[PDB]
Ligand SMILES: COc1ccc([C@]2(C#N)CC[C@@H](C(=O)O)CC2)cc1OC1CCCC1
Ligand SMILES: [Mg+2]
């Protein structure tokens with residue numbers, strides 16, 4: 001209450017603590033933060049989005065994330081939206097993004113894992129889930145999260161975009177689909193390779209601000225930005241990172257259990273009887289998170305040096321916790 005306001009003073013900062021805000025908001029981190037983010041950015045005035053209409057949509061959306069899922073609940077969506085909101089304000093990207101694009105990125109982050117069941121794309125495919133069948137085994141969950149988020153905008157009471165242009169609604173729809181689809185981990189290497197190529201030919205106005213010529217280059221940076229926000233736990237303060245690490249291992253171990261019950265092959269990192277939580281996080285930083293953040297940092301330097309320091313430091317805490 002007074003605690004909520006104290007915590008939201010950190011809204012524009014990486015150091016924001018999303019657990020605390022959930023505790024001070026009747027367990028509505030995502031509504032809480034989306035509302036804070038949208039007032040902070042004047043998005044409601046700019047796009048003539050009624051306040052009531054926005055709250056009802058956000059509340060419904062949060063309710064569609066599942067509370068009995070360890071990691072992929074409304075707290076995570078709120079984290080990615082907040083992380084994303086800070087990254088959009090990085091100095092190197094200053095006057096680069098239209099208000100529509102900014103709106104699309106934060107909306108994308110908000111809905112990006114909605115209705116997630118606490119199991120991977122691979123599991124849904126191997127068990128012949130209705131979702132895998134619906135989606136022909138390709139970005140199964142990701143296609144689903146989009147389908148749900150765009151469905152909920154259909155009833156006029158929740159169409160936060162009622163007042164955009166037709167041409168504006170389409171461009172947003174195109175951008176959001178593109179960004180959520182890019183959170184699919186199977187596409188990570190392809191995305192990281194492309195990010196490295198964009199860094200190679202990077203250009204700036206002279207004031208250390210990137211020159212991103214039309215749609216292609218702009219959506220590529222937004223794709224990677226939301227993907228970075230989604231893989232941002234290990235760049236956050238250690239107290240936060242450990243709670244996030246603990247929640248993701250609870251989700252995985254539950255999957256390992258659901259896998260075992262059914263005689264399926266259990267995947268090593270989902271095996272509670274063999275998986276080292278610590279080695280597991282070190283591998284995650286070495287082979288996935290650091291290579292990505294190292295490249296993001298190159299693109300916006302030196303805006304993300306602090307983050308790389310924290311990362312390299314959290315990496316060592318986990319290393320030092322293994323014999
Ligand atoms: C804080 O630790 C983690 C946080 C998020 C993730 C995910 C990845 N990559 C799991 C997969 C998820 C997805 O594709 O649905 C995206 C997020 C994975 C994490 O760690 C994994 C499991 C243990 C080490 C690697
Ligand atoms: Mg996801």
Ligand SMILES: [Zn+2]
Pocket residue numbers: 076080112113183230
């Ligand atoms: Zn996610």
